[PDB]
Ligand SMILES: N=C(N)NCC(=O)N1CCC[C@H](C(=O)Nc2ccc(Cl)c(F)c2)C1
């Protein structure tokens with residue numbers, strides 16, 4: 005019979021030893037060997053409150069990824085050191101409670117993150133979470149089981165980030181083609197405009213429910229730095245900055261074929277870890293391709309709309325805890341009393 009507590013967690017994964025990919029190397033020396041068998045138990049007739057915005061597991065994961073990137077993705081300049089090209093493809097990470105501690109997991113299929121949960125169970129580990137770092141769009145995550153879910157520590161307060169949990173993924177295919185000749189930094193992502201705009205209309209329809217039927221408008225970000233005005237993400241080791249203006253086109257339809265986002269590979273990065281600007285080596289040679297699932301969106305809601313008929317939303321990002329938070333929302337650690 006538990007109690008809300010914070011225990012230092014431990015990680016488990018199916019990482020391959022002697023693999024050159026940095027996620028496998030970190031998981032091999034930092035997550036449990038052992039090869040565990042965690043198990044579930046339904047808590048019959050039981051209800052419990054959750055808060056995905058006040059979750060210590062979020063900061064536990066955040067400590068891991070920061071440690072993983074510092075050991076694996078070293079910048080040439082911060083400090084003037086080595087910076088080799090590395091193998092980079094995130095793998096799932098499971099988080100597990102030690103003895104005397106359990107994770108409580110919400111099985112409500114329309115759970116929004118905060119509040120009471122009816123289908124509560126106790127598990128030893130979380131599901132496999134891929135630690136994908138990105139802005140504006142959440143990549144390669146899990147999908148909402150039933151409806152599109154709007155997540156917010158408080159949807160009335162405009163200062164609190166919103167996580168849109170898509171119930172169906174939209175594939176985005178980013179490439180920096182090969183061939184000493186030309187701007188080797190130019191890149192691009194291709195998206196199905198028909199697919200994407202169908203989902204964006206469903207997000208628009210779901211946002212309308214929350215804001216007493218109100219013209220929902222999308223505006224590319226003004227404030228913030230390159231990594232948050234642009235859709236940012238690491239692909240095979242390289243830092244990608246993609247202009248997402250075509251995705252938040254309030255127009256869209258003579259406009260629903262293949263959308264091509266212009267991208268760039270950047271060398272000097274304002275680190276998501278807070279540690280400032282850091283410079284990496286120029287792009288590797290050859291075809292750099294990543295095909296990912298868009299599984300969520302990060303939005304800010306403009307202020308000063310209480311006397312209008314419109315709500316205006318902008319793609320956000322910047323705090324990676326929101327990314328971990330988007331996959332850990334159904335969990336909470338509790339000390340077994
Ligand atoms: N200053 C404080 N308190 N925290 C750091 C901060 O304030 N940050 C916002 C300022 C810049 C940073 C960013 O998010 N960098 C980034 C880099 C590469 C990729 Cl792939 C990505 F998704 C994101 C993070």
Ligand SMILES: *[C@@H]1O[C@H](CO)[C@@H](O)[C@H](O)[C@H]1NC(C)=O
Nearest residue numbers: 116118119120154155156159
């Ligand atoms: C989430 O659901 C709970 C139900 O108890 C509600 O109190 C809260 O306002 C909801 N938040 C959002 C953003 O839907």
Ligand SMILES: *[C@@H]1O[C@H](CO)[C@@H](O)[C@H](O)[C@H]1NC(C)=O
Nearest residue numbers: 046111112113122123124125
């Ligand atoms: C709880 O979730 C399980 C699967 O996770 C499923 O049978 C159903 O959605 C719920 N069942 C009960 C008994 O609450």
Ligand SMILES: *[C@@H]1O[C@H](CO)[C@@H](O)[C@H](O)[C@H]1NC(C)=O
Nearest residue numbers: 144145147172173174296297
């Ligand atoms: C992408 O989503 C599809 C279905 O939406 C899923 O079957 C597939 O495993 C996902 N891929 C990744 C890398 O998550």
Ligand SMILES: *[C@@H]1O[C@H](CO)[C@@H](O)[C@H](O)[C@H]1NC(C)=O
Nearest residue numbers: 150151152171172206207210
């Ligand atoms: C996703 O959610 C919307 C409601 O927001 C619903 O209309 C749509 O049918 C759902 N799609 C799937 C594939 O379940």
Ligand SMILES: *[C@@H]1O[C@H](CO)[C@@H](O)[C@H](O)[C@H]1NC(C)=O
Nearest residue numbers: 118157158159160161162163
């Ligand atoms: C959410 O929004 C505002 C806080 O500024 C207020 O109207 C409301 O009571 C808040 N509720 C919670 C649970 O934070």
Ligand SMILES: *[C@@H]1O[C@H](CO)[C@@H](O)[C@H](O)[C@H]1NC(C)=O
Nearest residue numbers: 177178179181194293294295
């Ligand atoms: C992704 O785009 C590249 C460049 O156009 C292409 O060669 C590759 O086949 C695409 N991937 C898929 C799965 O279509």
Ligand SMILES: *[C@@H]1O[C@H](CO)[C@@H](O)[C@H](O)[C@H]1NC(C)=O
Nearest residue numbers: 196197198199200202261262
């Ligand atoms: C784009 O998505 C629509 C939505 O169903 C689909 O019918 C169409 O085949 C897709 N286009 C391509 C080129 O895959």
Ligand SMILES: *[C@@H]1O[C@H](CO)[C@@H](O)[C@H](O)[C@H]1NC(C)=O
Nearest residue numbers: 208209212216217218219313
């Ligand atoms: C409610 O929003 C819809 C768009 O989904 C719009 O067509 C309709 O006119 C709105 N209703 C009112 C009363 O403004």
Ligand SMILES: *[C@@H]1O[C@H](CO)[C@@H](O)[C@H](O)[C@H]1NC(C)=O
Nearest residue numbers: 224233234247248249250266
């Ligand atoms: C992104 O691209 C669109 C059109 O491709 C352009 O209108 C917009 O100015 C670009 N964003 C920035 C910050 O330059």
Ligand SMILES: *[C@@H]1O[C@H](CO)[C@@H](O)[C@H](O)[C@H]1NC(C)=O
Nearest residue numbers: 094143144237238294295296
């Ligand atoms: C998403 O997963 C796919 C398949 O596992 C992989 O090819 C791709 O590189 C991943 N995307 C990112 C941004 O890590």
